[PDB]
Amino acid sequence: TVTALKAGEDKSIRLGLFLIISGVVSLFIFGFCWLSPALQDLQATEANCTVLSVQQIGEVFECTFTCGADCRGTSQYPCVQVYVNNSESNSRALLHSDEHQLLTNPKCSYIPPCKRENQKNLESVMNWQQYWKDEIGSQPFTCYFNQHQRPDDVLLHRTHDEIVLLHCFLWPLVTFVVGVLIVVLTICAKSLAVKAEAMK
Amino acid sequence: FIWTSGRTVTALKAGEDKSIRLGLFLIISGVVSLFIFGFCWLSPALQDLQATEANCTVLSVQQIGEVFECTFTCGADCRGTSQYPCVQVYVNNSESNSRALLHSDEHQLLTNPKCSYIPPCKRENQKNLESVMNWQQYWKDEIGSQPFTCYFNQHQRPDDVLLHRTHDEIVLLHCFLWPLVTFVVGVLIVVLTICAKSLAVKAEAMK
Amino acid sequence: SRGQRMWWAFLASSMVTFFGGLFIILLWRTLKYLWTVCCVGWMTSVKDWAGVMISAQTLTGRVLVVLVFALSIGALVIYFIDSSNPIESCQNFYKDFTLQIDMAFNVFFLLYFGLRFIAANDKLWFWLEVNSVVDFFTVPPVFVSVYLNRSWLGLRFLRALRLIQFSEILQFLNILKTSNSIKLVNLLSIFISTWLTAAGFIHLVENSGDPWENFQNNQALTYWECVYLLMVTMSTVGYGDVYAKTTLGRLFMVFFILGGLAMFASYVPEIIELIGNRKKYGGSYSAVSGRKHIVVCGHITLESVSNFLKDFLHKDRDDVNVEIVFLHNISPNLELEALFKRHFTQVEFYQGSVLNPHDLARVKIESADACLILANKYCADPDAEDASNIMRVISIKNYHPKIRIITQMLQYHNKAHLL
Amino acid sequence: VNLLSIFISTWLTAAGFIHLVENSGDPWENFQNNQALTYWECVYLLMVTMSTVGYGDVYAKTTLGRLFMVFFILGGLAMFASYVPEIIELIGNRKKYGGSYSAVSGRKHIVVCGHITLESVSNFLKDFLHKDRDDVNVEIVFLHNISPNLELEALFKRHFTQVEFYQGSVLNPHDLARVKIESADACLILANKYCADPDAEDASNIMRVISIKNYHPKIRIITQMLQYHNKAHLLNIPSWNWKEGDDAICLAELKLGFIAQSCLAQGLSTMLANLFSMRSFIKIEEDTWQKYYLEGVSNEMYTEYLSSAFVGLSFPTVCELCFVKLKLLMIAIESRILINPGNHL
Amino acid sequence: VNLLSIFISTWLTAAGFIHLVENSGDPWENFQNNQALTYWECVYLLMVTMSTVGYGDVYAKTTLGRLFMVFFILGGLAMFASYVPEIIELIGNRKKYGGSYSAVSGRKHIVVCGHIT
Numbered sequence A: 001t002v003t004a005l006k007a008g009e010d011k012s013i014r015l016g017l018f019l020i021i022s023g024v025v026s027l028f029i030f031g032f033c034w035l036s037p038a039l040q041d042l043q044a045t046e047a048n049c050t051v052l053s054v055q056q057i058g059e060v061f062e063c064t065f066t067c068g069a070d071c072r073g074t075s076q077y078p079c080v081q082v083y084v085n086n087s088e089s090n091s092r093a094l095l096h097s098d099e100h101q102l103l104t105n106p107k108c109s110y111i112p113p114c115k116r117e118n119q120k121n122l123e124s125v126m127n128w129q130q131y132w133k134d135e136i137g138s139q140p141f142t143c144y145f146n147q148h149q150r151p152d153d154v155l156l157h158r159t160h161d162e163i164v165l166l167h168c169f170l171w172p173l174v175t176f177v178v179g180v181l182i183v184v185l186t187i188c189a190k191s192l193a194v195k196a197e198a199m200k
Numbered sequence B: 001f002i003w004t005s006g007r008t009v010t011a012l013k014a015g016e017d018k019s020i021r022l023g024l025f026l027i028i029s030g031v032v033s034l035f036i037f038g039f040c041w042l043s044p045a046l047q048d049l050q051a052t053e054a055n056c057t058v059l060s061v062q063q064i065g066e067v068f069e070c071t072f073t074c075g076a077d078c079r080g081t082s083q084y085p086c087v088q089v090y091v092n093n094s095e096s097n098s099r100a101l102l103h104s105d106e107h108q109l110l111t112n113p114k115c116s117y118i119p120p121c122k123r124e125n126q127k128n129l130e131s132v133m134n135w136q137q138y139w140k141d142e143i144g145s146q147p148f149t150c151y152f153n154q155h156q157r158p159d160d161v162l163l164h165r166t167h168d169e170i171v172l173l174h175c176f177l178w179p180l181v182t183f184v185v186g187v188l189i190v191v192l193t194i195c196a197k198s199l200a201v202k203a204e205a206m207k
Numbered sequence C: 001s002r003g004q005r006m007w008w009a010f011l012a013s014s015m016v017t018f019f020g021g022l023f024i025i026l027l028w029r030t031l032k033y034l035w036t037v038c039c040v041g042w043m044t045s046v047k048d049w050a051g052v053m054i055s056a057q058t059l060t061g062r063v064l065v066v067l068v069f070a071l072s073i074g075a076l077v078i079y080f081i082d083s084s085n086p087i088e089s090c091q092n093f094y095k096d097f098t099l100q101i102d103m104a105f106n107v108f109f110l111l112y113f114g115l116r117f118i119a120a121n122d123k124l125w126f127w128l129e130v131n132s133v134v135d136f137f138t139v140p141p142v143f144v145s146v147y148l149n150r151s152w153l154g155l156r157f158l159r160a161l162r163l164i165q166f167s168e169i170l171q172f173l174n175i176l177k178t179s180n181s182i183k184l185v186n187l188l189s190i191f192i193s194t195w196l197t198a199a200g201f202i203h204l205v206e207n208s209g210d211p212w213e214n215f216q217n218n219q220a221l222t223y224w225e226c227v228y229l230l231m232v233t234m235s236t237v238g239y240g241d242v243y244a245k246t247t248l249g250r251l252f253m254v255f256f257i258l259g260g261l262a263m264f265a266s267y268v269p270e271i272i273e274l275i276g277n278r279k280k281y282g283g284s285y286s287a288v289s290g291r292k293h294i295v296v297c298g299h300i301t302l303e304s305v306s307n308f309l310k311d312f313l314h315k316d317r318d319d320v321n322v323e324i325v326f327l328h329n330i331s332p333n334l335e336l337e338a339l340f341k342r343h344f345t346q347v348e349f350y351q352g353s354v355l356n357p358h359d360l361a362r363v364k365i366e367s368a369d370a371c372l373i374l375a376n377k378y379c380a381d382p383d384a385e386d387a388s389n390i391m392r393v394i395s396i397k398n399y400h401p402k403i404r405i406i407t408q409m410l411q412y413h414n415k416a417h418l419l
Numbered sequence D: 001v002n003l004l005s006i007f008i009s010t011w012l013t014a015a016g017f018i019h020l021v022e023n024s025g026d027p028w029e030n031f032q033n034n035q036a037l038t039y040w041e042c043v044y045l046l047m048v049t050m051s052t053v054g055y056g057d058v059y060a061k062t063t064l065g066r067l068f069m070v071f072f073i074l075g076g077l078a079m080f081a082s083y084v085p086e087i088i089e090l091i092g093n094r095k096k097y098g099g100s101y102s103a104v105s106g107r108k109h110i111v112v113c114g115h116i117t118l119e120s121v122s123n124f125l126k127d128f129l130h131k132d133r134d135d136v137n138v139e140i141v142f143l144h145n146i147s148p149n150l151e152l153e154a155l156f157k158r159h160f161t162q163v164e165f166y167q168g169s170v171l172n173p174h175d176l177a178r179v180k181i182e183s184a185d186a187c188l189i190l191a192n193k194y195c196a197d198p199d200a201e202d203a204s205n206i207m208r209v210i211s212i213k214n215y216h217p218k219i220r221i222i223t224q225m226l227q228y229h230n231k232a233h234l235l236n237i238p239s240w241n242w243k244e245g246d247d248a249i250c251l252a253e254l255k256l257g258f259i260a261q262s263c264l265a266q267g268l269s270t271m272l273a274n275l276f277s278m279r280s281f282i283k284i285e286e287d288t289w290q291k292y293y294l295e296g297v298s299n300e301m302y303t304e305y306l307s308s309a310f311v312g313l314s315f316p317t318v319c320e321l322c323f324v325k326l327k328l329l330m331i332a333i334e335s336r337i338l339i340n341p342g343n344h345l
Numbered sequence E: 001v002n003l004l005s006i007f008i009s010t011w012l013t014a015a016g017f018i019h020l021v022e023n024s025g026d027p028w029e030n031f032q033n034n035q036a037l038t039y040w041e042c043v044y045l046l047m048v049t050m051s052t053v054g055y056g057d058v059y060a061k062t063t064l065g066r067l068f069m070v071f072f073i074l075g076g077l078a079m080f081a082s083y084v085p086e087i088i089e090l091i092g093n094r095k096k097y098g099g100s101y102s103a104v105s106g107r108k109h110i111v112v113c114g115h116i117t
């Protein structure tokens, strides 16, 4: 026959196919977006690491504080640099703590939380330095290194958390599975309703 | 171009119906401009009226031993970038009861929050130097004086203090007065036109 | 209470409401029928009452749809106010009066959705209507907002899709009737709704950056800056003062460029074509004391009018104060409008038909000294021309028996019918 | 699929050529003037160029790249401006009035077809849905091969709970099945009275009835006919049965008959036409011929059964009783169709 | 003359309104966000907008100005795209085969007409 329910059921097939396509397409989009970040992080080695020298270069860089709502606040801070041992190079390389720090100023080992007062960023860098200054010959850190591209830079932290990576690939797969269930339940309803209609 | 370019009745009825179109356009323009000024003033009016008013007293003053640059204008196309002393002033207030930097007017804070003042910028370094000295020698002596009345914002600026408001209430008032007047004028045009149409037919029957 | 995010709870409340319901519908279609293989009515009176409420059929129903129109604007204005605030934050339900108003509006939209659901013939067709989808993506997240004592500027922008139903509401209210006016309101509603909705999606996506990029590449654009960006894109101007910088944003802009350009280039010419066609030669003649006038009609053409005015306004006549009023159903071309501008103080033209007594009243035939009817001498059929001019005279004489008529006739046997 | 394939292929290929050329600079410039653009940044650049938006956030900086962009501007703009309107025109033409009617228990429906037009539908609904009738629960289903215009769609929105429209042809048994003709109480066929050729119109309406009767012999059909000789062809259809309510309203027969009866009594054609039009009593206070005419116009002719206390009485007595005390103008006829029978039979 | 007058008048009038609005900034912003544009710079801006070229060398920076530019983009693009093709179509249709024949002494000529194909 034809039936009254055909319009809603065929629209339900169009939705289920659009979700299958959108699941696969967003999987490729996130695939290319995460390709360079995921390789650039997961190619970094994990190593045991120990401090071997510390110093200030006798010169200052500028950070920018924010008040909240439209401030620049450009303010000087001491440039402290720290050199560390690692299992691959076994030689002098500059510690940068987090990746962001390296990307924003690789000549210093730290950037303080920038503030309206020069004195607070000075004492913050002193309060940070007096830790790594005493860690000379201490029990090893665990730290990250990249011999293929960064033979003289060292990191304390990863470039991204695996949670945000996982969520970007979970919801495309869930979208695809939901689309498949909509297609299957709709085709099941269409093909079973005609058996019930003949059996009535 | 865009998209590959192109692919009874009475004699007075015309003027009166055009007068209705005008009165409705003024009603619509009154309401629409009220919403436009509403969104334009929303963030400024909240950001100013959320600031508290307080009694305030000076507690320290100093120059940071370093200089910022202002720009003078001659009139007609000058840059004139010129150094001035950075003086900073700290003040008491009733909410924080603690050290916060005075900035005088809001503009000053927005242009250089590390100093408490900016002089009227001039072609001579000596005149902006002595202007900052002549300003500083006031707030330098106001230590322990009778309170100012001053403005503060605990929700967003816990370490900045202002002597002045961010806008005057007169320009705010005018932006909401003339939309309302426009709407009222539009309503009077509609009412007087409908009154003329509906009364003229009574006079024409009574003649 | 900062340092925690809850955006997924707002989004899940919409996704679970829409799909959860949809599966209940379907599972109900697979269980009702399967039971029969394994093993006037009261409901219709409720469905009749709900249908009679959903349309403006009764006083109550017409009050309801006027509230739907007003609260659709109100709920969109609440989203405009909220768009200036942080993307996620805490706000107490007993302190922030905007969230109380947003509650009262969304409680009304829940009840209106309930009436629509009751009135519908097929629940599955209804559940997949655009107006139902907009409710699942905008009603549940407000109840989550009040329960969590928090806000997220998530899919709120979908409120702008309620403007699409304004032409339907105005058709129910018997306000829209004419085809051009319904077209105009349809085109304006779809254009404005699409523009404001698409501006809200790019707003959300640019203010919350690419997830892979760990959200670090976001751009601080206001909602109005996104509305301006989409207009500059749709029109194809594309200044590049502002543009989408995130990958998700650039992605969306590729699909908006494919859909929105065709929408602007199709709709803007047509909305301008449905407006401003103001009839220039409407209105009517005003007679002045001591000055008579004549009405001229029939074959009004540039050569006929210029020949007529040369003989009528000749200087070998005496002080002819007689004003000449032309009545013709076709708008004059630029040449004939220019001929009337050369006679500005003694000729007037009004568009209309000699067969309509309203147009005869507009031209003041009851006070005209005479009516003159010009014939087409060079017509393809003299009998159809004479029969047309016979019609004109019976119309003019029907409106006013006493007016003097002067008329050209082509064939003599048609002159006998005339008398 | 041809337009989509050529559009996407050209765009992705041209993005790859500008990618290569911008990442490896002008040879003369000793390759020093290269620009670090990703492939996706080149895909975005070409879309922003094809559409003519041209933001200039990103643009080709090398001479080879600018060179290529001149030829891409000459070819790719014409490609976008031609293809994008046409790909959008080949999509989304979703037929709004497909689907079919679902009947509900205890509520009958009728199918209306033929000359479906704004004036014909609005005239039909004014007489059919009149309040001088009784509780008319009958649903009205229109079947017509042309999509309704905005005015006629608006007329259907004003009747949302009692009118449904489906696009289709009376000559197609699938469309007759979609409109549930096998359960319709009657089918009504409207004629174009003002057609250029009455014989082609009548022959078209004859086709409609043989199609409806072919799909279901037992449905009641009501149809307008223009010419009387075409009505004689109509009753040669084997399942056409005027004894059970198949009605041919012949306009030439009834028109010339009204006129003929007005030759025996002037104005009879006026009151007969007023008795079938549904109209309320309009009230006018001014003493005019209109106040007494409008009172007469308020009447219509109605059928009813009579038996309790009227079986076996004389026809005049029966007329007197219900005229005098039931205050209604009695039986003009009737047993069979006997007009004003008298004292016998 | 109608198309030229309406085009030029609209362009020069709209350039004057954006001139005034950009040189005297947003009232809420305490008039501080004004831009020093000359009138001719506003005439150039509106032509670059109407044509849809939109270089963005100059553009409206104030909120009132951006506001006006949204309504000018909705009205002025349709005006330019309709009027410019038609003004160009009403010009330059110069009849190429007007003029007349000049005879020369001692050389005769014939005239050919009718079915010229």
Ligand SMILES: CC(C)CCC[C@@H](C)[C@H]1CC[C@H]2[C@@H]3CC=C4C[C@@H](O)CC[C@]4(C)[C@H]3CC[C@]12C
Binding pocket: C006, C008, C009, C010, C012, C013, C014, C016, C017, C140, C143, C144, C148
């Ligand atoms: C029909 C709608 C309202 C229900 C949709 C499902 C929604 C409401 C579900 C899905 C996920 C759930 C949320 C996830 C977890 C939390 C955090 C908790 O600290 C408060 C409750 C809250 C916020 C839940 C509330 C209910 C919730 C939002």
Ligand SMILES: CC(C)CCC[C@@H](C)[C@H]1CC[C@H]2[C@@H]3CC=C4C[C@@H](O)CC[C@]4(C)[C@H]3CC[C@]12C
Binding pocket: C020, C021, C022, C023, C024, C025, C026, C028, C029, C121, C122, C123, C124
């Ligand atoms: C509220 C959400 C979650 C589900 C709504 C209730 C669902 C599960 C139930 C309640 C009433 C049921 C509907 C009532 C009757 C009909 C009409 C029939 O011709 C199609 C199925 C349909 C449409 C039923 C489908 C299942 C149904 C919609």
Ligand SMILES: [Ca+2]
Binding pocket: D132, D278, D279, D280, D281, D297, D298, D299, D300
């Ligand atoms: Ca009656």
Ligand SMILES: [K+]
Binding pocket: C238, C239, C240, D054, D055, D056, E054, E055, E056
């Ligand atoms: K540009």
Ligand SMILES: [K+]
Binding pocket: B001, B002, C235, C236, C237, D051, D052, D053, E051, E052, E053
């Ligand atoms: K362009």
Ligand SMILES: [K+]
Binding pocket: C237, C238, C239, C240, D052, D053, D054, D055, D056, E053, E054, E055, E056
């Ligand atoms: K551009």
Ligand SMILES: [Mg+2]
Binding pocket: C323, C345, C346, C347, C348
């Ligand atoms: Mg005059």
Ligand SMILES: [Mg+2]
Binding pocket: D139, D160, D161, D162, D163, D164
């Ligand atoms: Mg129905």
